[PDB]
Design a protein around this ligand. Structure first.
Ligand SMILES: CC(=O)N[C@@H](CCC(=O)O)C(=O)O
Ligand SMILES: CC(=O)N[C@@H](CCC(=O)O)C(=O)O
Ligand SMILES: CC(=O)N[C@@H](CCC(=O)O)C(=O)O
Ligand SMILES: CC(=O)N[C@@H](CCC(=O)O)C(=O)O
Ligand SMILES: NC(=[NH2+])NCCC[C@H](N)C(=O)O
Ligand SMILES: [Cl-]
Ligand SMILES: [Cl-]
Ligand SMILES: [Cl-]
Ligand SMILES: [Cl-]
Ligand SMILES: [Cl-]
Lengths: 288, 289, 291, 289
């Protein structure tokens, strides 16, 4: 699967002092099966604001023979559509309350974002498959409270494995279905975790536009978190917000389930290579 | 860029031998588009029974730069699965009564058949894209009677057009969605006719194992159906089973909308290349007339 | 060879096909397992300056369907323009350029320019081409006192041409020859192409010019067919058979004396090359022994 | 379209260790101008003695998108051929006296060596263009003394530049032509020096089997020659062989024209990549100082 374009060669010659790190991390990521390298979660905003960088970083991985499983959201675009129509979005515990009309908007938005990412990759000569259904099976998280929102109960691996075996990056929406075919909205961070539990990749990467987790009291970027030692302390800290406290609790539960060779990385999309192919990385890594 | 092997070019030359045929091929080969070449409906049984030949035929089309829109069924596999787990299939008027468990089976079988065909194509060097949702929008056909069965109200073309633009054959299931996201079961003959309605392709082909429609009173294959003359009579004949009635009604409604130059060919896969490259039909040809 | 039909190859192949007969003749070439060289094509030098894209396109078609021609080109007209611009009058006898030291310098520069133009035009269409500018033709002086630096070709070294083809590149040859000790000698491209056809015994022998064959000067009509055994002796006595036309006809007659009766030579415009190679054509001038 | 395999990229990464080296490689890898990366002179003996390693090294360069100008000799093969027909090689001052028959032997050997190297390269997937005339224009050096030997007066750059633009390594012999087309023999060290003068490449590399120049008084390889200081003294030393003297003089005269940042490396093929990718000299390095 390794086939370096001119662009790939140029990117590989970044931070040449780390070239032995680069070759070691390439070798490592390549040693496991093609479906156990990485789950990469993409925030919806990246597809609207930073599509070239997102497509380029995924093309880099593709061209060096790596097949990340790509799972994206679409939240900001949904809020845009709702707003144009005069409708305010509504969340509880960071989860969108999704009635029938809202689900219609969520579906349309997911499909548009999905095809945009797929097409941007194909324009770079990267084979990509839109996987928009048939992967996540769910029941209702809480119908009275969230309406059409899912709690994922099983994952069907076949579409992702087939894509990778055919030489195409699988590009998934985080939309789930009940077994009987009612589509149910699921938060992208949550859907990514479920993929990770089933595929057990070496890496789960959460891409954003803000960077890694920053310490409020000291202002410094948090490079690493050994969760066995630090979790109890970090959650006590009064600087961490509710939105950050929610993400970190579901990361803790994921890494408790996964083996210790798995790890999480929260990074700016433009720091993907630096995070993955150097010792010190770029954003926040989280180990158990 | 596009390239064709010696073997590909030899097979192409074996399929075209008149000025009209060459002109037709080149028109769609070099087409910057809007105009679609073909909608091909694939009977579900063909995926279980004759996959290599189906895949090989479609791969040849791809290797000569043609991009048919492919929609397949899965009815026979659903019946087998239901029967395997000790559940009796349930139909009314040739339409599957699809309760919640049945729909789960339908979805699983559709996905399995879809991936089987896509993967057979990839193995032959054909780029193929599964398209499993986001194309058909539907209302309930009759919720009390058929349960989770749809009546298609519109077709979203973008996924199909995006696949073709990227150089991948679009391989579609016939499942549709309500606007609020309830997936609904739709007979594949009906869904394929709705694709042909909105794309108005040069060729409209239905693949079955019988290679057409057989007249029950005579035991002879029907070569031609002139709908304007024969439709009302044909539909009153007691040998015409519900599945066939569903198909012919859809085709009749389709051909009422399309121009009189359009036709529908119900054929076996062995006659596909001849049906697509020439005007010398095979199997059962249906048109307005 | 490498058969790889691009979009343009497919279009070019099928555009003029309208019968099963035409389909069948293309199939004959594509399914053949013959090891005989497909073609020697002589290119009139003027075509490289006047119709380069079309020339390159036609040669590209052959390359893409795996039927590599051996290409030998001239450069006479642009040499004459160069000499004329320097206030020097071209000097010929019997179709052959009298070539003193200064003229040879001009000839060498023009050959190299035309050669690289053709090679580069092919490369720009994705066709690998190899300039072959020495090491093929070995010659003696034809007549030193009469013609000066002009060669009588004594042998053809095939290896350079065969290596090019084996590597997947069209061999693009100039018609200059060398004495054993390395004095380059000018040779008319019609003659040098004939020497290639003699030694390679190709299936097809085509001479490309702009007028599209040979014109009967008395009647003002393109000659469609020349049967040499019957017509040659009378042909050569005609008033309009002189200069370059006489040299051409004599060369082709001598070539065909050596080759089997099944061989023939077509003198055509490049626009008719595909039709004439593969299908039915009344274009240009066909020359054969006849019987 | 450019692609590189894993092993190619691994070998590239093994050759490049500093940021300076990265930027140097990128400058020539991404070039859209007429700048030249390298002129590499190949001793004739290497083509008979170590062809696979030479071809493999040049193929690596090609596979990382670098297009060195390659000029090779053939002296040892000519000597062998002359000796095979009972003729003693005849030199004066390191320059072959070349009568008509000797020229015929030189021409045939040059063509054979040239096609050997080109073909070795093509077998490794490298596009290579033989360039056997139309580059070097020369007068007679001294006709009474050396006979058919040339003094190069100009280099025509177009054939070499057209080759590189087409994605093919230009593989040159050192034969020259008088304006009126007499081929004249020219020592390959001199011809390669004339190429370096007009192309002003980043790297100037002479490949020989000894991997440099050995000091005869000590038996030790000379690592660095600083010409402004050492040239006059060096050329007086009685161990300095005919051929070596000619080479050192050409290089001295070449370096008088080039900027002081330039140098010439006389090395073995095993040190070629190190010499090209890094500024750590190997073998015998020559510069003005
Ligand atoms: C349940 C829920 O909040 N879903 C998300 C899915 C998109 C995303 O995560 O970006 C939403 O915003 O509707
Ligand atoms: C409603 C209905 O009958 N759907 C079909 C769809 C599959 C097919 O057509 O092959 C079914 O068998 O469930
Ligand atoms: C000897 C002779 O007439 N050579 C030809 C070669 C070029 C050509 O044929 O176009 C000439 O014009 O000099
Ligand atoms: C003039 C002269 O000595 N030429 C060299 C050319 C070959 C080489 O340099 O290897 C010779 O040996 O004839
Ligand atoms: N933020 C960090 N400290 N990252 C360390 C990354 C280490 C290594 N590149 C990896 O991906 O596993
Ligand atoms: Cl938002
Ligand atoms: Cl599904
Ligand atoms: Cl069937
Ligand atoms: Cl004509
Ligand atoms: Cl040597």
């Amino acid at each position: 699967g390794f086939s370096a374009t001119r662009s790939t060669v140029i990117q590989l010659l970044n931070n040449i002092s780390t070239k032995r790190e680069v070759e070691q991390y390439l070798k490592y990521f390549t040693s496991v099966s093609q479906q156990q390298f990485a789950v990469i979660k993409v925030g919806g905003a990246i597809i609207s604001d930073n599509l070239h960088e997102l497509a380029s970083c995924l093309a880099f991985l593709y061209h060096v023979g790596l097949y990340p499983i790509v799972l994206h959201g679409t939240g900001p675009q949904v809020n845009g559509r709702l707003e144009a129509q005069g409708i305010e979005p509504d969340y509880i515990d960071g989860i969108r309350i999704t009635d029938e009309h809202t689900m219609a908007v969520v579906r349309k938005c997911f499909l548009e974002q999905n095809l945009k990412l797929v097409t941007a990759l194909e324009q770079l000569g990267v084979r990509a498959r839109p996987i928009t259904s048939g992967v996540f099976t769910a029941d209702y998280l809480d119908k009275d409270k969230y309406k059409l929102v899912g709690n994922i109960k099983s994952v069907t691996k076949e579409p992702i494995e087939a894509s990778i075996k055919a030489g195409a990056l699988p590009i998934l929406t985080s939309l789930a279905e009940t077994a009987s075919g009612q589509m149910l909205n699921v938060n992208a961070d949550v859907a990514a975790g479920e993929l990770a539990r089933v595929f057990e990749p070496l890496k789960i990467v959460y891409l954003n536009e803000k960077g890694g987790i920053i310490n409020g009291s000291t202002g410094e970027k948090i490079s690493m978190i050994n969760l066995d030692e630090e979790y109890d302390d970090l959650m006590k800290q009064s600087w961490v917000k509710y939105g950050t406290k929610l993400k970190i609790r579901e990361i803790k539960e994921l890494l408790d389930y996964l083996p210790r060779s798995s790890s999480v990385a929260i990074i700016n999309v433009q720091d993907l290579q630096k995070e993955l192919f150097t010792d010190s990385g770029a954003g926040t890594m989280i180990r158990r």
